[PDB]
């Protein structure tokens, strides 16, 4: 925006390997160093655009310096590598999705 305040956005608390089962509640939260951060999520090398995506079922939640990614429904196909990238820092995680009994 206008000339006011700029700077890199370092990831205080990045993502971490999560072990869940198909059909559960997954919440990928991340702590940043700036509230209004333009953090971008990437899966298997795909920029998770923030536009009309009827296909997807996940919801975006911005709580200031924290970005959560709820997954109403998760499946084995959802298991990948969520690489978080920002204008200051980046990270990666491994979502382990296993089948139910």
CATH number at residue 26: 2.60.40.10
Query: What range does the domain containing 78 cover?
Result: 1-101
DSSP symbol at 73: S
Task: For the sheet with 59-62, list strands across it.
Answer: 11-13, 30-32, 66-70, 59-62
The residue length of the chain stands at: 101
Q: Which residue has the tokens 């956005």?
A: 9
Q: Solving technique for this entry? A: NMR
The answer to whether residues 95 and 79 touch, using CB atoms and an 8 Å cutoff, is yes
Question: What residues contact 32, with CB distance under 8 A and at least 6 apart?
Answer: 9, 10, 11, 12, 39, 65, 66, 67, 86
Q: Could you give the angle at the alpha carbon of 41 between the alpha carbons of 86 and 52, nearest 5°?
A: 120
Q: How many domains does the chain have?
A: 1
Pairing verdict, β 90-91 and 11-13? unpaired
């Amino acid at each position: 925006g206008s000339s006011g305040s700029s700077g890199p956005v370092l990831i205080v608390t990045p993502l971490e390997d999560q072990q869940v089962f198909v059909g559960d509640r997954v919440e990928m939260a991340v702590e940043v160093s700036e509230e209004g951060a333009q953090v971008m999520w990437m899966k298997n090398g795909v920029e998770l655009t923030r536009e009309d995506s009827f296909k997807a079922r996940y919801r975006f939640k911005k709580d200031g310096k924290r970005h959560i990614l709820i997954f109403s429904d998760v499946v084995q196909e959802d298991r990948g590598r969520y690489q978080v990238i920002t204008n200051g820092g980046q990270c990666e995680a491994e979502l382990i999705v296993e089948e139910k009994q």
